[PDB]
Ligand code: HEM
């Protein structure tokens with residue numbers, strides 16, 4: 263079954279809200295994000311749902327995701343990709359994400375965040 267089913271709607275929503283609480287405290291990232299992260303988190307949940315083989319919530323609403331393009335306006339450094347990743351690792355610790363679903367998600371996120379570097 264789809265890897266999204268190994269995490270689910272509730273835990274995914276908690277992973278992502280936790281993540282954006284950390285982003286909002288992270289001095290390198292907070293400046294380049296919106297001041298209000300309410301909408302970003304809503305869109306990452308849709309996106310992460312799609313990314314984990316669940317319904318394509320993101321495309322359905324915003325269109326074709328082409329993330330590297332959507333990210334190009336912003337100054338994504340290697341060191342910023344690393345802060346995002348660090349925030350995300352911490353967020354996973356907090357919700358107690360573990361095992362093969364943590365390995366699959368995070369391993370993919372690592373490859374994606376580096377592909378965001380511009
Ligand atoms: C390299 C570190 C990253 C930085 C600094 C970064 C930064 C940003 C910023 C500033 C926004 C604008 C917020 C908004 O428009 O709502 C954004 C949106 C978004 N990011 Fe990233 N991002 C990074 C990596 C990633 C990764 C790895 C993913 C994949 C899970 C991702 C997925 C998204 C999505 C789905 C949006 C919303 C796009 C939209 O507005 O439709 N980003 N990001």
Ligand SMILES: [C-]#N
Pocket residue numbers: 306
């Ligand atoms: C991008 N969060």
Ligand SMILES: [Cl-]
Pocket residue numbers: 328329330331
């Ligand atoms: Cl892409």
